[PDB]
Paper text:
Here, we study DHPS-3-dehydrogenase from Cupriavidus pinatubonensis (CpHpsN), a bacterium capable of utilizing DHPS as a sole carbon source. Kinetic analysis of CpHpsN reveals a strict preference for R-DHPS, catalyzing its 4-electron oxidation to R-SL, with high specificity for NAD+ over NADP+. CpHpsN forms a domain-swapped tight dimer with 28% of surface area buried at the dimer interface, with the interface featuring extensive hydrophobic and hydrogen-bond interactions. Domain 4 lies at the C-terminus and contributes to the active site and is also involved in dimerization through a metal binding site. Coordination of Zn2+ involves three residues from one monomer and one residue (His411*; * denotes the other monomer in the dimer) from the other monomer, showing that the enzyme forms an obligate dimer.
To probe the roles of Glu318, His319 and Asp352, we conducted site-directed mutagenesis to convert each residue independently to Ala. The E318A and H319A mutants of CpHpsN suffered 580-fold and 240-fold reductions in (kcat/KM)app values, respectively, which was mainly due to a reduction in kappcat values. The 3D structure of the ‘closed’ CpHpsN H319A·Zn2+·NADH·R-DHPS complex displays a productive geometry with the primary hydroxyl carbon of DHPS positioned 3.3 Å away from C4 of the nicotinamide group. In this complex, the Zn and R-DHPS sites are not fully occupied, and the final coordinates are modelled with the occupancy of 0.7, whereas the cofactor NADH has a full occupancy. The partial occupancy of zinc presumably arises due to incomplete reconstitution during purification. However, the concentration of R-DHPS used during crystallization was in excess (>100×) and is not a limiting factor. This observation therefore suggests that zinc is essential for ligand binding in the active site.
Residue numbers in the entry:
A (entry chain B), B (entry chain A): 2 to 436
């Protein structure tokens, strides 16, 4: 295992800056509520307008959105919705018998209110807007509040707004960043605090969601976008290089990783990536140049197993696999947000319209979670019921363990049932706690 | 809706104290690592022994655990495992065709390393020990690190230790509180950082997990225990009262709630609870007296619908239902951690040996999450693969949407595939970005 390109910075590098800003802003917002948010909206995003859009404003701001644009977004919404409904079917309710007379089961219930964030800064994240909202509706969530940042010194990008509306948002707000996340968490402006807040964003957005976990549920830590490509000698260096640059344009902090067993592939890609970046237009060129320099990495490995080991350690948001024997890679990789098998599909496809959600774990979160999905909006709750007969065993065990732990009042709830249901039975219910 | 008893305190009252302590302690542990943890163990828990238990120590400390105790714990481990294995079956892998030629699927994979906390302070939480570890093993997790607080002069309570060992823990540490949670998160002492940290504890433990979310996944915010009872005129006040007192003994901060449509039931319960508490031994009496006084509430409602409304808003960790027509309540209740239908079962049974997990959401977390389960250790990841033909539709939509967003490099990954796979095709790929 050898690093042909090592990065100066990682997803961890900017953590402290993000956490500093978020701690300050959240303190302010907790203390000063809506006034703090309007002021942050003013000073950060130059926004003095109304925050909650009326139906009139939405209609007005999207009236001129062309039919061909709407057709593309509607098509994407359908793909996302279809995959979401398939995922919903994968998680089932059930009941079982355990000890005789003990019935237990699992209920699967949607949350009531979701807040969805769609980012807008360098780019306007049209696709993010339907990724959150369409998924929440597919999960059967009753109320969906959606926010996106005022873009390029104006309001919500009209195509983001269209995405939100067509995906089924009930409330739309022109709010960005930390103040958006906090507003949705606390129910500022709407009076409807979210049960779950979802959606991608820069390091401040992702840290704000992470800090507010508890107050709300979340999808996943979904910060500056990442990409890894696993490639063997069959891979096409021109396509690999193209794919790396594709995510590098997200911004200065987006890492692009190449893991390969072919030095010839690595070398060609390392030559091609700067060339591809130089041909980009200004904003993308600016982002990708910094990202590739500071965060880009290339790792040469000797075997497939070493690639797997490295990939799993990196736990990339998105992982492309351009190799032979794709079944082996599906069977063996274990840590990634979203997997793209073979050359034909690619991350940008997943980003816009493949179907599976693009809101995905960054900064190692793929070690413990997949991305936004209907699963993040379903609660899996347990229920149980017993016969009186079942409590003969369950009760005596409960009383004895409870007493071993020191929990006398717990044990008495079992004693009381035994005395009531079976006044003639006599069991070892454990030595009463005296201290 | 009338408050026959209104609480002066709620689960939210103590949040500020918890956060202050946790912020300080986590800062110290980030700064000083193992040195801070050894210092906290000495100063908070009076422990200056080794932290990681050796195989010989475990054998030696569990050698005189009687056969009767072992049989009860083993029976409980069986019930938890049985229900866990059933829950595991409820979440399926799948693949589907979306747009023709687009294959997308869901992989369900266990995390690599889990940290389990079993509390020990007022009481020694034997059941908590198997709740975490047995569930992790049922999920297929290969490495389980297990911690419990030094209890009453010694290291880990011997019965907690037996539970950890019999449930299948790989590493066991004598370590409590925030320092335990932190150590498992950062892999201190073991060199094995957890992917997910689970387990219940006091307000500091729960806040530490919440604050470390991101570094690790977690189960849920599982702080000071809560109980709610729904009762109608059919309920037995002696049992209801016993059950409320059962959970109140957990500590000064444990809320016990009664929601009822019967005033007579309410009055008898309110008379009984004090009498029952007075009959408890000192530790439990002290805890329950304060909990009932400060946090206990009793609410009278006119209709079942009002009871559901109020129950859903309280979102209790554990919810007993002593009513007629239990199917209606199962159909209509939406916010609770774990549901106990009918009088026969009770929270204490679920705590020790019913089967469903007892590590459950507090402080309103049941609005967005169920308790600890195999689901908290299973990652739901997505994969996809495409034919070249599929990329004709998917690629053109990607390129157009990308360019609408301003993301030119994204669009170029589609352009490059269209040129390679279909050089003679002419699609609208969008106006290239110039800015
Ligand atoms: N992980 C995932 O699934 C996805 C991640 N992303 C990432 O989302 C990010 C989007 O970033 P942006 O374009 O900035 O949009 P954004 O919407 O995340 O950020 C814009 C907001 O952040 C605020 N902000 C910016 N700098 C600030 C500062 N220093 N202090 C306080 N507030 C500040 C702005 O005022 C505005 O309110 C990119 O890094 C992109 O890669 C995008 C899509 C999916
Ligand atoms: N929600 C759930 O599913 C469950 C909740 N529980 C709850 O767990 C709790 C256990 O509480 P404890 O007996 O305290 O056990 P614990 O193990 O949670 O707390 C003991 C540890 O906390 C530390 N600690 C205590 N006070 C501290 C302070 N002021 N500053 C710093 N560290 C401090 C101690 O030094 C020790 O390391 C109870 O409230 C119980 O109701 C128990 C089982 C299940
Ligand atoms: O490009 S998008 O903003 O649509 C999604 C992003 O690539 C995933 O991090
Ligand atoms: O009593 S236990 O500590 O075993 C579980 C507790 O009641 C759940 O909050
Ligand atoms: Zn992207
Ligand atoms: Zn209990």
């Amino acid at each position: 295992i050898s690093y042909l390109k090592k990065a100066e910075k990682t997803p961890q590098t900017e953590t402290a800056t993000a956490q500093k800003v978020v701690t300050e802003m959240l303190a302010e917002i907790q203390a000063r509520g809506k006034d703090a948010v309007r002021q942050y909206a003013k000073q950060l995003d130059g926004w003095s307008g109304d925050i909650v859009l009326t139906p009139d404003q939405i209609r007005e701001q999207t009236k001129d959105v062309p039919a061909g644009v709407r057709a593309d977004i509607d098509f994407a919404i359908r793909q996302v919705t279809d995959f979401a409904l398939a995922q919903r079917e994968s998680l089932k309710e059930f009941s079982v018998e355990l000890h005789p007379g003990v019935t237990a089961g699992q209920r699967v219930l949607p949350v009531n209110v979701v807040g969805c964030y769609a980012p807008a800064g360098r780019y306007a994240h049209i696709a993010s807007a339907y990724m959150g909202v369409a998924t929440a509706k597919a999960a059967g969530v009753k109320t969906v509040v959606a926010c996106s940042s005022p873009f390029r010194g104006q309001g919500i990008h009209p195509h983001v707004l269209y995405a939100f509306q067509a995906a089924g948002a009930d409330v739309i707000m022109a709010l960005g960043g930390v103040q958006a996340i906090a507003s949705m968490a606390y129910g500022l402006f709407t009076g409807k605090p979210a049960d779950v807040v979802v959606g991608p964003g820069n390091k401040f957005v992702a840290e704000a969601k992470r800090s507010l976990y508890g107050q709300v549920g979340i999808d996943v830590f979904a910060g500056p976008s990442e990409v890894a490509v696993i490639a063997d000698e069959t891979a096409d260096p021109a396509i690999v290089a193209s794919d790396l640059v594709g995510q590098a344009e997200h911004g200065h902090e987006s890492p692009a990783w190449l893991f390969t067993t072919s030095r010839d592939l690595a070398d060609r890609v390392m030559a091609l990536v700067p060339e591809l970046i130089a041909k980009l237009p200004p904003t993308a060129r600016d982002a990708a140049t910094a990202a590739w320099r500071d965060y880009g990495e290339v790792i040469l490995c000797g075997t497939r197993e070493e690639v797997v080991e490295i990939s799993d350690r990196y736990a990339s948001e998105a992982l492309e696999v351009h190799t032979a024997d794709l079944d082996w890679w599906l069977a063996n990789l274990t840590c990634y947000g979203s997997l793209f098998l073979g050359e034909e599909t690619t991350v940008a496809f997943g980003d816009k319209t493949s179907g599976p959600n693009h809101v995905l774990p960054t900064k190692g979160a793929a070690r413990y979670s997949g991305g936004l999905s209907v699963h993040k909006f379903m609660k899996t709750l347990t229920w149980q019921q017993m016969t009186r007969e079942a409590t003969r065993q369950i009760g005596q065990v409960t009383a004895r363990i409870s007493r071993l732990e020191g929990m006398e009042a717990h044990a008495r709830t079992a004693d009381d049932r035994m005395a009531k249901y079976f006044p003639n039975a006599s069991f070892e219910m454990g030595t009463p706690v005296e201290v």
